[PDB]
């Protein structure tokens, strides 16, 4: 395993957002041309094993551990919606609560990490969170105006390309794609840049404050708005389905307060140069 490896994301110009928004309330529109300097992106979501190295080094206690609870999806039991439950003792080591464990899933994405927990990790690692624009550029994997990192078909060539939901959400996840919950961080094909699970599996924090008001002005290395209350997260998770939550597109976007944590939310890091 080299689950902390980074790939070089080449300098370029891309179309961020879409003029065919699918969730208009989320400010997916308008399409806008953004210039991104070359930088490095983690190939993988940060795994349980990688996060454990950080905690071993620093003694870091996550926000969920200090609060004493975190949000768990009801379908994973042995609020934003009725299927989200605040569970006492749910945290990154205990992803469904105090009687769950990560011992059998060391290579799965770390979960129940807040935006602050993510920043702590990335900075410990000699890295940082990506901006939303960096994240989206990276997600798109060198293709223009596609739905997904790989193109516009959900199952190209009849193959599963990401870990999302199949079946009737929230009652039945068929596990058709091979995973009901998370998958290992190196599961599924990489995109054109070498990135794995950038849509699906775990949601991914970015550095930007959330807004839905964007100009069509062309920008260079944008950082998002200077203030806000929620931070931007991207990419969707193992829970997403076309029927209720169509957010496994590069252009999709959502938000949470920075001290928030949940059983479907993780992150990956970026860097200006190799650490
Ligand atoms: C984090 O630290 C723990 C505790 O030191 C490590 O687990 C130990 O690893 C040693 C060396 O391989 C074993 O001999 C012990 O039996 C382990 N102790 C326990 C209680 O698990 C762990 O490997 C470290 N984690 C990472 C990812 O580096
Ligand atoms: Ca799945
Ligand atoms: Ca992901």
Give the topology, please.
Layout: E1 6-9, E2 12-16, E3 32-36, E4 39-42, H1 48-58, H2 63-67, E5 69-73, E6 84-88, H3 115-124, H4 132-140, E7 167-168, E8 172-173, E9 203-209, E10 219-220, E11 231-234, E12 254-256, E13 265-266, E14 270-271
Parallel strand pairs: 3-10, 9-13
Antiparallel strand pairs: 1-4, 2-3, 4-14, 5-6, 7-8, 9-11, 11-12
The structure holds a molecule of 2 linked components (NAG-NAG) and calcium ion (2 copies).
PDB class: oxidoreductase
Keywords: Formylglycine, cysteine sulfenic acid, oxidoreductase
Assembly: monomeric
Q: How would you summarize what this structure contains?
A:
The chain has helices spanning 48-58, 63-67, 115-124, 132-140; strands at residues 6-9, 12-16, 32-36, 39-42, 69-73, 84-88, 167-168, 172-173, 203-209, 219-220, 231-234, 254-256, 265-266, 270-271. It is of the alpha+beta class. The chain has a single domain, classed as Alpha-Beta Complex (paralog of FGE (formylglycine-generating enzyme)), CATH 3.90.1580.10.
